[PDB]
């Protein structure tokens, strides 16, 4: 897990509040480029491209012990091998092998 990718994940939460909240109603009216074919708000059209890293692109939920996009269960945040460790400790609730 990379400290620059962990620090970017925090910056994304604080920018989703900034560029991805209360802008969707404006985005619905500024994104039309055929209804009159006239240019009169170009600065506001280039505002929809201001966010580059804080929108649903790049954002992945990842394995919460390695930062890795692979081999994990999002219902626990644990990998397909650390689930064996935690199930052998009773540390994932009710998850068992035999003993039923």
């Amino acid at each position: 897990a990379k400290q620059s990718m962990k620090a970017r994940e925090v910056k994304r939460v604080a920018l989703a509040d900034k560029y991805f909240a209360k802008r969707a109603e404006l985005k619905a009216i500024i994104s039309d480029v055929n209804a009159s074919d006239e240019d009169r708000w170009n600065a506001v059209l280039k505002l929809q491209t201001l966010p580059r890293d804080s929108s649903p692109s790049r954002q992945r939920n990842r394995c919460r012990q390695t930062g890795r996009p692979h081999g994990f269960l999002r219902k626990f945040g644990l990998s397909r091998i650390k689930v064996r460790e935690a199930a052998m400790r009773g540390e994932i609730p009710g998850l068992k092998k035999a003993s039923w």
Binding site: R80, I81, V83, A87, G94, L95, K97
Partner: protein, 98 residues
């Protein structure tokens, strides 16, 4: 009308929790004698045996998820307090609803 949500990952622990809330109901007047068990669910999960380069070979783990709602026709001066102060049991999630 109100409902008391009981959730558990085992078919015997949900019946122990049902006996624990009935034992407490009989000790706050009358409120629960024999509720309905509802339909059940399962979730199946796989884990790897070697930490690298073998994902074909897996081992299987299971949870059996239960839900009970109890359902109440009239709460008392003891239902809204003494039955809420109940600590019940470990391994079970308890909530009041509506």
């Amino acid at each position: 009308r109100i409902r008391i949500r009981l959730k558990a990952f085992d078919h015997r622990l949900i019946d122990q929790a049902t006996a624990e809330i009935v034992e407490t109901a009989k000790r706050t007047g009358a409120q629960v004698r024999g509720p309905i068990p509802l339909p059940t669910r399962k979730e199946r999960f796989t884990v790897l045996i070697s930490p690298h380069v073998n994902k074909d070979a897996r081992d299987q783990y299971e949870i059996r998820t239960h839900l009970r709602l109890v359902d109440i026709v009239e709460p008392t001066e003891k239902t809204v307090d003494a039955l809420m102060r109940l600590d019940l049991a470990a391994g079970v999630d308890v909530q009041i609803s509506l």
